[PDB]
Design a protein around this ligand. Structure first.
Ligand SMILES: NC(=O)c1ccc[n+]([C@@H]2O[C@H](COP(=O)([O-])OP(=O)(O)OC[C@H]3O[C@@H](n4cnc5c(N)ncnc54)[C@H](O)[C@@H]3O)[C@@H](O)[C@H]2O)c1
Ligand SMILES: NC(=O)c1ccc[n+]([C@@H]2O[C@H](COP(=O)([O-])OP(=O)(O)OC[C@H]3O[C@@H](n4cnc5c(N)ncnc54)[C@H](O)[C@@H]3O)[C@@H](O)[C@H]2O)c1
Lengths: 327, 327
């Protein structure tokens, strides 16, 4: 019964995309009753590898894959998109300093913002994965004249899932019984995973673990997790990032569980006193494609301090891009 | 929910394993109500990386992942196993020659065949993916005294799905309308993809395509497809091989669709006059854990000759293995 939706994914020949695309086509992201047309974007040099990804997608004979198209032009890839996962971002190069990274990313995200605004559906749902996620999402929405800024979000869901995984291990309880986890702020080393409102099988988290653990063990362990993976495997965590991307879109489109909320970085409207405009991770619920920040939670001194440190980081980054005349 | 099954996977830190494990844990192979316990095996030098893969699986927060254990000991990995996916095989090493390759695999598959017989469930279902899969499955079942040899299979489902894909492409019809594809024989260049019994949206395949296209274009192109992917991406077809492994287990454990069949390489019991013993791909249907070869199809001359050629190849390989004292 359902007509196909079109899903645009950039950086599609890269490792996150190689773990992402196959599960999207299998129906994991939007439902096993919803056929998808994948519109994939790569830079010109990676187009040959993209063709080989396309042949592997064909070789899975996915009944929900209603169409497949690969391109290096953003205006083709975003054409009529329902959803856009913006994974591709500037690579690190030698002696390429910070501002140099900002500039290159600024150009990609400006151009992509523009294209979305010109050819996508006006209600396109956008997720930015490529680093620095939050600031890239800011440059994209700011350059996307005529689209709702709230349809541009950045991914903190991998940090959120890591946090739940560590709390589960510590309390010896199944990860499916952890609820109300929140990661606030930037996707960076200043992010704040908040246990003050989390529950472990009905019980408040902080009745099961102590503050010392929290501050000296859990926080630095969630923060260092991506580096732990690279040390062990020799490669970054693509499969678990792809899984977090699928979850962020799926829970936004299909809704969050009753009684629960997820973390999403979205353009702040001043919730919790956070400065307007920056893309900041809040606790959110979603229903039928729209989300709402969870307000009213009580914020103690420990959380406030942390929430502000991370907001300030984002404000400085935004200061940088502005100075570069990017927004 | 059902009670958890134990799934053992070898070569778990390799490429096919990195694409396989997350979809298994997600519920794609045995259903969304069946929790799984993953028992992962690697050689000792890849244990560090396997720990990094373990961490990414934790970080997915999967609700059906009821346990996860990594080991370098087969008797640990296979313990109480309900399913065993034998992905890891002898790597190619320089100057290493055929029979050399044969010996190194011979060592792997005997010790594995042995661990499974000592410690897995008696009804353990075994899928061999590592090359040469058909002959590897022969070594393992021959060395797994006590287990039903028919619970030992090899994967030809990737060839089967590639064939479905090319036919859908040629006829311009969706892949979901293609039924009754069969890939007979070895997972090698002598595989025989059979269009004689296939149906495209209800019509026999050969009313839509001609014999010349079939023999000049379709057969060689399905056989070369693994090479095309390597030449395009620079790496082999891990994600689509991981999908075909999931489908192979899924359709055997859950069941094939009505009026349809799948390809699986199983120990020959003389079906179609195929020599006994060798692990040969046939058309099969399956219901709730057991399969049956589809018998009584009409085999014309064009098909028999090809069935024969790939049958001979396998007979010869088995000869080699026996000569090496492996079975
Ligand atoms: N937010 C998060 O949690 C999180 C987690 C991990 C990684 N990431 C980010 O994901 C991004 C991609 O990661 P990866 O591991 O796949 O890298 P990768 O290098 O394997 O792939 C990145 C891909 O980006 C493509 N790309 C670059 N510019 C592009 C453009 N203008 N149009 C389309 N495609 C383009 C490249 O060609 C490459 O295929 C990185 O920025 C990384 O830091 C974010
Ligand atoms: N049947 C088919 O359709 C099909 C398709 C694709 C690939 N293959 C086979 O897949 C196999 C693995 O492919 P890959 O791309 O993942 O290679 P890879 O090298 O990336 O991974 C293989 C993994 O197996 C591990 N390994 C080696 N010996 C082992 C043992 N004794 N026990 C446990 N692990 C062991 C390695 O350490 C490595 O981690 C190859 O033999 C390839 O020929 C078969």
């Amino acid at each position: 019964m359902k007509a196909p939706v079109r899903v645009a994914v950039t950086g599609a020949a890269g490792q996150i995309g190689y773990s992402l695309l196959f599960r999207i086509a299998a129906g994991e992201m939007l439902g096993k009753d919803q056929p998808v047309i994948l519109q994939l974007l790569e830079i010109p040099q990676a187009m040959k590898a993209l063709e080989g990804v396309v042949m592997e997608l064909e070789d899975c004979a996915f009944p929900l894959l209603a169409g497949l198209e690969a391109t290096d032009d953003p205006d083709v890839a975003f054409k009529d998109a329902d959803y856009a996962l913006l994974v591709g971002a500037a690579p690190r190069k030698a002696g390429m300093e910070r501002r140099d990274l900002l500039q290159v990313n600024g150009k990609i995200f400006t151009e992509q913002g523009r294209a979305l605004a010109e050819v996508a559906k006006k209600d396109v749902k956008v997720l930015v994965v490529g680093n620095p996620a939050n600031t890239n999402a800011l440059i994209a929405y700011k350059n996307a004249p005529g689209l709702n800024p709230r349809n541009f979000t950045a991914m903190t869901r991998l940090d959120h899932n890591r946090a739940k995984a560590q709390l589960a291990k510590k309390t010896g309880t199944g990860v499916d019984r952890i609820r109300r986890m929140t990661v606030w702020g930037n996707h960076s080393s200043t992010m704040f995973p908040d246990l003050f409102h989390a529950e472990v099988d009905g019980r408040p988290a902080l009745e099961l673990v102590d503050m010392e653990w929290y501050e000296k063990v859990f926080i630095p362990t969630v923060a260092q997790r991506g580096a732990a993976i690279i040390q062990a495997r020799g490669a970054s965590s693509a499969a678990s990032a792809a899984n977090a991307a699928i979850e962020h879109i799926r829970d936004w489109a299909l809704g969050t569980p009753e009684g629960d909320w997820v973390s999403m970085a979205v353009p702040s409207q001043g919730e919790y006193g956070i400065p307007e405009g920056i893309v900041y991770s809040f606790p959110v619920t979603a229903k039928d494609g729209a989300y709402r920040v969870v307000e009213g939670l009580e914020i103690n001194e420990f959380a406030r301090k942390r929430m502000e440190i991370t907001a300030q980081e984002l404000l400085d980054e935004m200061e940088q891009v502005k100075a570069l005349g990017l927004i």
